[PDB]
Amino acid sequence: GLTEEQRMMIRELMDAQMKTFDTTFSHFKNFRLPGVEAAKWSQVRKDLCSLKVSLQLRGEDGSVWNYKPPADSGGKEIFSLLPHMADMSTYMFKGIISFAKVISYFRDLPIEDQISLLKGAAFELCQLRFNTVFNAETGTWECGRLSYCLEDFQQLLLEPMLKFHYMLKKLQLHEEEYVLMQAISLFSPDRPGVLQHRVVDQLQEQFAITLKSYIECNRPQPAHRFLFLKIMAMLTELRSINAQHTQRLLRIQDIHPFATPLMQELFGITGS
C-alpha cells in the first residue's frame, strides 16, 4: 500500500545498501592484530573493558586462529585490540560513506552538509550494519571469516551498546526496515554544523513516513503492534549511545593515540 515515490525510495536505499555493504567482509584485509591523570586512566580503564571480545579468524584453507584477550592487570595491555578495532571501524566507515554517496537525496545536499551529516551518523550507521551480522544466541558478530565473541551474562546487558544490539535483534527487522533506519539516522537535521536544516528535516520525515507505511502494509501481526514506535525509540537510544561512545573514544585517544586518518576526520581531529 506504498505510494510510487515510497517504493522508489525503498528501492534506491536497498540498491545503495546492496552496492556498498560487504556482508561477507571479503574486502576487509591488511588489518592489524594483537601482537604475540590517574583518574583519567581509571576512567579509560573503565571505558575499554565494557566491551570485551575474543577474536576468531578462519583461514581460507580451513585453519583457525583464536585470540583470547588479557585480563586487566593495570597496564597498557588493555590497548592490545585497539589497532585492530580501528582498522575494522575504518573499513565500516568507508562502506557507510559509499552508501551515503550513492543516495540521490544525499548527493543533492551541499557538500558541507554531506560532511556534517556523515560526521554525525557514521558510528550509528556502522552499528545498524553490525546488528545484521549479530548472532544473539551465541553473543557473536559474524563478519565473514572473522568472528567477535563476547567473553563470559545478564550483567553483560548492562552495557548500553550491548543491550542495544540484543533489543534491536529481537525485533526481527527486514532488510528494508534496517536500511530505512540508516536513512533516518543519516538525515538527522540536528547534527552539529548542518546548514540545510529544513531540507534535511523534510527528507528525514519522508523516510520515517515510508517506514511507518511499510510496516503498516507488511506486518499485520499483534507481535508487531507499535513496531514503528519501537524502532524510533531505538534510534533515539542509538543517538545517546553515539554521544557516549564519541566521548569514550576521545578520552582513550587523549592518552593513547589510535584513530586512523579517516577516523580523525570524522571525529574532527586535525593532526596538530
What is the amino acid identity at position 121? A
Experimental method: X-ray
> Which of 269, 267, 123, 115 minimizes the C-alpha distance to 194?
115
> Which 3 state secondary structure label does DSSP give 218?
helix
97's enclosing H/E stretch is helix 82-102
- Residues in contact with 157: Cβ distance below 8 Å, sequence separation at least 6, in sequence order: 163, 166
Nearest to 105 by CA among 212, 20, 213, 182: 182
Cell matching residue 136: 544473539
**Cα distance between residue 40 and residue 38, in whole Å:** 5
Q: How many CB atoms lie within 10 A of CB 225?
A: 11
Cell of 191: 547534527
Query: Is the Cβ–Cβ distance between 120 and 142 less than 8 Å?
Result: no
Q: Over the Cα atoms of the chain, what is R_g?
A: 19
Residue type, 9: M
The response to whether 2 counts as a known ligand-binding position is no
Closest CA to 1 of 216, 231, 173, 223: 216
Q: By C-alpha distance, which of 152, 135, 151, 148 is closest to 57? A: 148
- 157 annotated as a binding-site residue: no
Classify residue 10 as left (phi > 0), alpha (psi -120 to 50) or beta: alpha
- Residue 187 annotated as part of some ligand binding site: no
Task: Give resolution in angstroms.
Answer: 2.2
* 84 labeled binding residue: no
Scored b (16 or more CB within 10 A) or e, 28-43 reads beeeeebeeeeeeeee
CA angle 118, 234, 13 (to 5 degrees): 50
Binding residue per annotation — 27?
A: no
User: Considering only CA atoms, which of 165, 232, 212 is closest in space to residue 10?
Assistant: 212
**Alpha-carbon gap, residue 260 to 83, rounded angstroms:** 9
225 is in an annotated binding site: no
3 state SS for 200-215: HHHHHHHHHHHHHHHH
Q: How is residue 44 written as a grid cell?
A: 579509560
